[PDB]
């Protein structure tokens, strides 16, 4: 069940901490991949759960354990971190999955490219401590804090995956509790207890009637039904595998951040920079298990799903060969120069090289004239905490802080689903449009119910089968993915002569290691992998092998290398566990074959809101704030020039004197503060005409540049203030007709800001001359 949405309206200024400051700011707010403020889904679930537990207290008569706490554990999942002792029941997952609440998509789009607006959404709030004795600001307790302007309307997807067997009665219970939590929730984020972050939270399609049903029925409920795993069901239908291999490219785009545990270590999880093929198998079930016995195919090895690597050159990127070495100072693929394929090239004279390790290289060919294109994955370390629910702060007993590396949004990946014709015949004969049905959005990774894990999947058209170049002199091997091999006693191990035996047997040839003193034969690194059987709630056995990008080369000692057998192994992969993406391999690739030392790398708007759009009122606040600061800056820029003060008002310095005397400016300045609104131009015009009538006061403004007329113009001509300031307001506006709406709005303040700036700036230059 999808398309339930939470809506949030912030009714006071609000703050979601990064848990740190930056520079002059002691607190700064979390911003999404579009640099706007947003509420992380992990916060949102945490707050909503907390209010639901308040309801559970009210229904369990304050018993901290009971039937209704049972329901909350049912709805929001158990907290096996905090329960302790010999708890026997498996920890249940939540039924409810909640995204991050983002700003409205149109408002978000409007800010694109408009950096100064993206800043103006926040503003600084001060804070201070007072010494109880002296009753003054306690120095070195002065604090400046970023907060986000109120009135923001945010929304997040919710998904419920209620059990299909769930009683209709229990659905209204769950709707009752969830509705109640939204109603009872009042605040989120930082300094809740001091008035930041007051909000309304509502579910689409839940209303008081849902609470009314609970209030009428709640005494009749029971404990929630016990949880059940969704087991597999094999069937044995699969027609036995026959060539050709079809190859379906799947494109994956990270719509949200994704967490892909490389190695857990205490309270922090490091992330990969590719998507393991194992993550997609659930999606294979959810979209193809109606057409063939997916589970039988895996056990037979009739299916392979590769890893997803970053897309480069329109295709799957390839992990950088460890045969490449860069000049320790000046070179390597990171610097676009000085890269040596040590299978073919000597080290340069004197210069020490270092082997390449990270990153991905795109396409290469027998003479590219350029180093292959290099890909990179952007990643960020997100941070979270646990609240100890009674003292309502983190504590070391509750585990404090934890953090995840994530792949950020907008990164894009490619993987290949590889199927024998045997299954494709079955699938196609049942549905010719199946490749259209592969288009889906799914959740994968760690923490997948919350803000993490949203990815788009999209089939391309069928790719061509790879066509390795046969070469009866030499076999050369590139590990495109991690390679797992059993030792001769079925244990895992990593000994390269096992792989020597393996390949020569599989290709039905004999191999000899490259013996040359200055061309390296072998460049491998070990690999070890943490993993979990989610089917069984236990870790997987620690896989050990060679990591992707390891490479090695051999001379062929005897036999002939069949080009067709090479193709087969490149499609199927070698070693163990190939089905989930390991074992992927490339033979005689031109990149391992060519010499590259001479080469280098190659050289390397927005639209308005409709006036009727609901967030237009919120955008109006951002527009005014950004305009105000820009006006203040540009007025102060123009006040800085002694020619500009003469141009605009005719004030100038002549010898020791100012024209007019400072008192005459001060008099005018005192009147100008009555110019609150454009109709008040009466008052300023009234003053100037009363001034002009008194000859002695009129001539006080002689030796100005026409000053009395210049002031009259600036106060009267609606355009003239904007002509002087000369601000391109286009990057500072986003509302339809916002420019005219805001110019007519701010006119009175623009005048006050400009004249005040000029008079003040003029005074400084008078002091220099005086």
């Amino acid at each position: 069940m999808r398309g339930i949405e939470i809506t949030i309206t912030m009714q006071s200024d609000w703050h979601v901490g990064t848990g740190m400051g930056r520079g002059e700011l002691d607190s700064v707010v979390q911003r999404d991949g579009d640099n706007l403020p947003y509420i992380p889904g992990k916060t949102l679930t945490g707050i909503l759960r907390d209010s639901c537990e308040q309801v559970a207290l009210g229904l369990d008569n304050g018993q901290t354990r009971g039937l209704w706490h049972g329901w909350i554990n049912f709805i929001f999942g158990d907290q096996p971190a905090l329960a302790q002792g010999a708890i026997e029941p498996e920890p249940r997952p939540a039924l409810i999955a909640i995204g991050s609440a983002h700003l409205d998509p149109k408002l978000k789009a409007a800010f694109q490219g408009k950096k100064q607006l993206q800043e103006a959404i926040a503003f600084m709030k001060p804070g201070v401590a007072i010494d109880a004795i002296t009753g003054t600001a306690k120095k070195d307790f002065l604090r400046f804090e970023e907060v986000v302007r109120l009135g923001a309307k945010l929304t997040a997807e919710v998904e419920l995956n209620l059990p299909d067997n769930l009683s209709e009665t229990n659905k209204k219970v769950i709707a009752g509790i969830l509705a109640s939590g939204a109603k009872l929730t009042e605040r989120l984020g930082g300094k809740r207890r001091r008035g930041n972050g007051r909000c309304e939270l509502k579910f689409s399609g839940y209303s008081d009637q849902q609470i009314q049903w609970l209030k009428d029925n709640y005494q009749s409920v029971d404990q929630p039904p016990k949880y059940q795993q969704n087991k597999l069901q094999s069937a044995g239908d699969n027609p036995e595998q026959q060539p050709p291999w079809h190859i379906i490219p799947l494109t994956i785009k990270t719509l949200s951040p994704v967490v892909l545990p490389a190695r857990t270590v205490g309270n922090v999880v490091e992330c990969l920079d590719y998507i393991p093929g194992r993550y997609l198998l659930g999606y294979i079930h959810k979209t193809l298990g109606e057409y063939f016995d997916v589970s039988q195919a895996i056990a037979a090895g009739d299916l392979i799903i590769t890893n997803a690597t970053i897309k480069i050159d329109g295709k799957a990127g390839r992990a950088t060969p460890f045969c490449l070495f860069g000049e320790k100072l000046d070179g390597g693929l990171g610097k676009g120069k000085g890269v040596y394929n040590r299978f073919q090239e000597s080290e340069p004279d004197g210069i020490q090289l270092k082997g390449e390790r990270g990153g991905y290289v795109g396409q290469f060919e027998q003479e590219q004239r350029n180093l292959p294109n290099t890909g990179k994955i952007n990643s960020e370390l997100f941070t979270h905490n646990t609240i100890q629910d009674d003292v309502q702060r983190p504590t070391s007993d509750v585990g404090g802080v934890y953090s995840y590396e994530a792949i950020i949004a907008g990164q894009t990946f490619v993987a290949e689903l590889r199927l024998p014709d045997s299954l494709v015949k079955q699938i196609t004969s049942k549905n010719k449009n199946w490749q259209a049905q592969l288009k889906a959005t799914i959740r994968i990774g760690q923490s997948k119910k919350d803000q993490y894990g949203k990815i788009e999947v999209t089939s391309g058209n069928s790719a061509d089968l790879p066509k390795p170049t046969g070469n009866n002199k030499t076999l050369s091997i590139w590990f495109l993915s991690d390679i797992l091999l059993r030792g001769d006693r079925l244990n895992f191990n990593a000994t390269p002569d096992d792989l020597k035996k393996y390949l020569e047997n599989a290709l039905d040839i004999k191999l000899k290691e490259r013996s040359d003193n200055d061309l390296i034969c072998i460049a491998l690194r070990s690999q070890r992998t943490e993993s979990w059987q989610v089917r069984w709630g236990l870790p997987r056995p620690s896989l050990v092998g060679w990591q992707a990008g390891s490479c090695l080369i051999y001379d062929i000692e005897s036999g002939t290398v069949n080009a067709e057998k090479l193709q087969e192994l490149m499609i199927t992969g070698i070693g163990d566990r190939c089905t989930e993406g390991y074992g992927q391999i490339g033979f005689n690739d031109p990149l391992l074959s060519a010499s590259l030392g001479k080469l280098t790398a190659k050289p390397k708007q927005s639209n308005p809101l409709p006036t009727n759009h609901p967030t237009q009122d919120y955008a109006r606040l951002i527009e005014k704030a950004a305009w105000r600061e820009a006006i203040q800056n540009k007025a102060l820029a123009l006040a800085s020039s002694r020619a500009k003060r003469e141009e605009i008002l005719g004030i100038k310095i002549m010898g020791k004197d100012s024209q007019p005397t400072m008192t005459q400016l001060g008099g005018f300045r005192s009147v100008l503060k009555r110019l609150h609104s454009r109709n008040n131009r009466d008052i300023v015009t009234g003053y100037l005409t009363a001034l002009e009538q008194v000859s002695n006061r009129k001539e006080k403004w002689s030796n100005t540049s026409q000053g009395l007329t210049k002031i009259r113009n600036l106060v009267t001509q609606e355009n003239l203030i904007w002509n002087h300031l000369d601000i391109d307001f286009s990057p500072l506006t986003i509302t339809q007709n916002g420019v005219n709406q805001l110019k007519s709005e701010l006119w009175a303040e623009a005048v006050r800001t400009l004249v005040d700036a000029i008079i003040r700036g003029h005074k400084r230059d008078l002091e220099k001359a005086q």
């Binding site: 740190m20 930056r22 520079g23 700011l25 922090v268 490091e270 370390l381 953090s403 800056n633 820029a637």
Partner: protein, 278 residues
């Protein structure tokens, strides 16, 4: 052996920088490697620059004192001293140290570029002049966690870099003959430590010589077009005269100077390192 002795001795000298904690049982530092060419320690973060500077200065001085060095260093380079580069990663306590050290390796690899930028006069083969260098980063939560992403985020305009690194640590007199001396002075660590010192200065009522709000506007301006950032400096320096010290053009109208055809500034570092000196 002499190099190990120099390393240990310079460490004893440098740990004096932990002055504020000198009242209590143990200094907030842990050596983990302390010999060969290598120092590797964890320490209190805001101390690390001053600690590491004094280590490098003491290390260069110490290396001159040994005959076991002198005859080799003099023939290898023409100076009594050797030198060392350092990389400093500054992290929150829960930040995974594996990631932080990984960045420190990339940072020192950057700092070692002084080997390329500074060379022995008429050297043949061209060979690095002895000159200690620092690179560092402060891993704010949105600043990413890999060196390339970090530096990329600090290149908002394609022709512009908001950082100016590595910092040369060796004093000018010890470099004064070298080819690239003038480059080494532009990149001298002293330039940053001076400018941070300015931001820590106060006006008579006890408030810093630049207010925090103004600093925030300056950081914002650096992400704008050069002409906008150059404008913003003019506006604020006309009020807060101290910023006259921070201009880099030599025309007192830009925080930027032209460098290898790019525009770069040290000023941003003075904002972000504002607290991180002992």
């Amino acid at each position: 052996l002499a190099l190990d002795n120099c390393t240990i001795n310079a460490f004893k000298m440098a740990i004096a920088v932990f002055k504020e904690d000198s009242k209590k049982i143990d200094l907030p530092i842990v050596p983990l490697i302390l010999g060969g060419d290598d120092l590797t320690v964890i320490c209190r973060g805001d101390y690390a620059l001053e600690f590491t500077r004094e280590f490098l200065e003491a290390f260069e001085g110490q290396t001159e004192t040994h005959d076991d060095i002198k005859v080799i260093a003099q023939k290898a380079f023409g100076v009594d001293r050797l030198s060392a580069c350092a990389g400093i990663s500054i992290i929150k306590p829960h930040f995974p140290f594996s990631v932080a050290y990984t960045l420190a390796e990339r940072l020192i690899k950057s700092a070692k570029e002084v080997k390329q930028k500074v060379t022995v006069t008429n050297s043949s083969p061209i060979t690095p002049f002895p000159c200690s260098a620092i690179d560092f980063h402060i891993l704010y939560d949105s600043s990413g966690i890999d060196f390339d992403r970090i530096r990329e985020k600090l290149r908002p305009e394609d022709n512009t870099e908001l950082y100016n690194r590595p910092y040369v640590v060796t004093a000018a007199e010890n470099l004064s003959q070298a080819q690239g001396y003038e480059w080494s002075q532009a990149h001298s660590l002293q330039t940053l430590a001076d400018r941070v010192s300015y931001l820590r200065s106060e006006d008579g009522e006890g408030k810093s010589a630049l207010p925090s709000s103004q600093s925030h506007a300056l950081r914002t301006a650096l992400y704008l077009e050069k002409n906008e950032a150059d404008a913003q400096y003019s506006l604020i320096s006309q009020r807060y005269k101290i910023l006259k010290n921070f201009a880099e053009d030599g025309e007192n109208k830009s925080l930027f100077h032209l460098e290898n055809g790019k525009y770069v500034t040290r000023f941003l570092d003075a904002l972000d390192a504002k607290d991180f000196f002992a």
